[PDB]
């Protein structure tokens, strides 16, 4: 029993982390096969970040300008190219620790594990969610750019996030491994503000199912509701609209616990209108929305990865 | 910026996890050098756990009774012995992935990263704290026993916890890697209840310093207090007494932020007496006490591990 914010095992990703240095800028890169992926702002200085022209800046860069280091061994760069907002540094040595992997662009609401790095060395691992406004609430300091977010299913590492920027409000923005930013953010130090931080309704419901599975049932009520009526309350409290797809996705949890999805919605409705009354749910005094129905099932069933 | 519950990189520990099977019982073991460590209740059935005599049960066990498996390769056991509540299965092959490591018995209030496993395969990683009542609030299901808690400093893995039991209240109990239980718990399915779950005061203060560092300052007040007067309030709310040692340990954070430790105590006092008033601190609606002063400094400074 017990429910905890749980990241995937990071061993497979640790072995792909390298340090990329371009001039006076150092950040982390992802070494898969014979290619190193890193944020393209590695080629920028601090003054360049206000208004960079990346195509022009890259003209002054050759293969030997990109210093790639793994441990105390230095990778030979035999080619480089810019794809959207990442650079692909072709090296001459295939990473012997390349795991089975994919590049996946996640949707808002999905979760992933972040391996925060500095100078190509791992610092820690934590669980994140792509917010509806396409930011993430991470823990990143100077030099963390290049750190990746990922998921693991059995033996395949699905890379979905690369860290790029920290917005003036403290939240974080990045790209997929193809260099396309999540949301409307650019790799420029300009005025770009995050939108409304809506709550992932389907994830709160999955987390409430996990609470029931683990003994916390005080929040269960005697009411039910309809998707439309509940969504009227969700709008008021800045909750993402619940769709029939979300209901179907919660089916497995509904069956295991015997609590209809709309019954749980009515319980959530009361919590949004009346609060927690100083109580807690799975050790939290607020409604957690960074557990997917997939995460709850996986943690509550003991899925492993080899 | 941003502060997140952060576990150490688990790659070094993943490579030491094996599966130990004894009869019909399977659990995880820690393979360091040519020795495998696992909970001694692996030799027990479900009916044996009510009142086991481990010395007698082990007489019916030989080396070949202990099935140790790493991946799809099976370790040859050439010796076995019982140390407190763990078994040491001497194998004939030194783990080629043995990291630099130590066995450390942590004190209540200290934190560590847990690598939850099942059948010797990692499932996830999360951060835990040894509670003052010597339990931990983890996420463990059947077959997780053997999963270890650890810390990492640069290249040395300090193993401090091995999972053993889940108490009827949902919290978890285990031993150090020498087989001595934390607290008064035994590896018996008997009536043993956890004590008062006191709050780790020094950790709440470190977490409040981390909030200030990251922009959350609404809780800062105009008052100060003395260690004695604050402890009068700490007793009321079941908070561990704050000692001069705790003050000295918070020194580095006090210097970086310019907020005297006793000033922060007075701010905590108001929070305990008046609550949060529906506000949040670093995304939490309650006072977090599973960050040590050491964790805050490490995450806020970007310490890495190689
Ligand atoms: C205008 C001038 C003063 N610029 C600076 O000095 C400057 C700009 C940006 C950053 C940064 C960063 C970061 C990125 C991702 N995650 C965490 C942190 C540091 N320093
Ligand atoms: C009396 C009889 C019904 N016993 C059982 O079936 C029985 C006892 C104990 C467990 C367990 C466990 C566990 C340990 C550590 N972490 C998580 C879970 C499962 N099953
Ligand atoms: Cl909370």
UniProtKB/Swiss-Prot annotation, chains A, B:
It is found in: Host cytoplasm; Host Golgi apparatus; Host nucleus. Changing residue 49 to A: Does not affect ability to cleave and inactivate human TRMT1. Changing residue 205 to V: In strain: Zeta/P.2. Inhibited by pyridone-containing alpha-ketoamides compounds 13a and 13b. In turn, alpha-ketoamide 13b (tert-butyl (1-((S)-1-(((S)-4-(benzylamino)-3,4-dioxo-1-((S)-2-oxopyrrolidin-3-yl)butan-2-yl)amino)-3-cyclopropyl-1-oxopropan-2-yl)-2-oxo-1,2-dihydropyridin-3-yl)carbamate) inhibits SARS-CoV-2 replication in human lung cells. Inhibited ex vivo by michael acceptor inhibitor N3. Inhibited ex vivo by compound 11a and 11b. It catalyses: TSAVLQ-|-SGFRK-NH2 and SGVTFQ-|-GKFKK the two peptides corresponding to the two self-cleavage sites of the SARS 3C-like proteinase are the two most reactive peptide substrates. The enzyme exhibits a strong preference for substrates containing Gln at P1 position and Leu at P2 position. Changing residue 90 to R: In strain: Beta/B.1.351. There is a cross-link at residues 5, 90 (Glycyl lysine isopeptide (Lys-Gly) (interchain with G-Cter in ubiquitin)). Cleaves the C-terminus of replicase polyprotein at 11 sites. Recognizes substrates containing the core sequence [ILMVF]-Q-|-[SGACN]. Cleaves and inactivates human TRMT1, preventing tRNA guanine(26)-dimethylation of tRNAs. May cleave human NLRP1 in lung epithelial cells, thereby activating the NLRP1 inflammasome pathway. May cleave human GSDMD, triggering alternative GSDME-mediated epithelial cell death upon activation of the NLRP1 inflammasome, which may enhance the release interleukins 1B, 6, 16 and 18. Also able to bind an ADP-ribose-1''-phosphate (ADRP). 3CL-PRO exists as monomer and homodimer. Only the homodimer shows catalytic activity. Interacts with host FBXO22; this interaction promotes the proteasomal degradation of nsp5. This is 3C-like proteinase nsp5. It comes from Severe acute respiratory syndrome coronavirus 2 (2019-nCoV). The lineage of its organism: Viruses, Riboviria, Orthornavirae, Pisuviricota, Pisoniviricetes. The gene is rep. The chain holds residues 3264 to 3569 of 7096 of the full protein.
């Amino acid at each position: 029993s017990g429910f905890r914010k749980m990241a995937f095992p990071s061993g497979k990703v640790e072995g792909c982390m390298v340090q990329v240095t371009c001039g006076t800028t150092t950040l982390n890169g992802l070494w898969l096969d014979d290619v190193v992926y890193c944020p393209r702002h590695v080629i920028c200085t601090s003054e360049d970040m206000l208004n960079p022209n990346y195509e022009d800046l890259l003209i002054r860069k050759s293969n030997h300008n990109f210093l790639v280091q793994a441990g105390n061994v230095q990778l030979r760069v035999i080619g480089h190219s810019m794809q959207n907002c990442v650079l692909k540094l072709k090296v001459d040595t295939a990473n012997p620790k390349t795991p089975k992997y994919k590049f996946v662009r996640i949707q808002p609401g999905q979760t992933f594990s972040v391996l925060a790095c500095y100078n190509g060395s791992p610092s820690g691992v934590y669980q994140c969610a792509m917010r509806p406004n396409f930011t993430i609430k991470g823990s990143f300091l100077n030099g963390s750019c290049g750190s990746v977010g990922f998921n693991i299913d059995y033996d395949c590492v699905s890379f979905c996030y690369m860290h790029h920027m920290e917005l003036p409000t403290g939240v974080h923005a990045g790209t997929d491994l193809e260099g396309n930013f999540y949301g409307p953010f650019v790799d420029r130090q300009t005025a770009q503000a995050a939108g409304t931080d809506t709550t992932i309704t389907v994830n709160v419901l999955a987390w409430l199912y996990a609470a029931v599975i683990n003994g916390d049932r005080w929040f269960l009520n005697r009411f039910t509701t309809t998707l439309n009526d509940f969504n009227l309350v969700a709008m008021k409290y800045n909750y993402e609209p619940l769709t029939q797809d979300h209901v179907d996705i919660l089916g497995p949890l509904s069956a295991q616990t015997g609590i209809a999805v709309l019954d749980m919605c009515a319980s959530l409705k009361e919590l949004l209108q009346n609060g927690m009354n100083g109580r807690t749910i799975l050790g939290s005094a607020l409604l957690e929305d960074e557990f997917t129905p997939f995460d709850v099932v996986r943690q509550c069933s003991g899925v492993t990865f080899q």
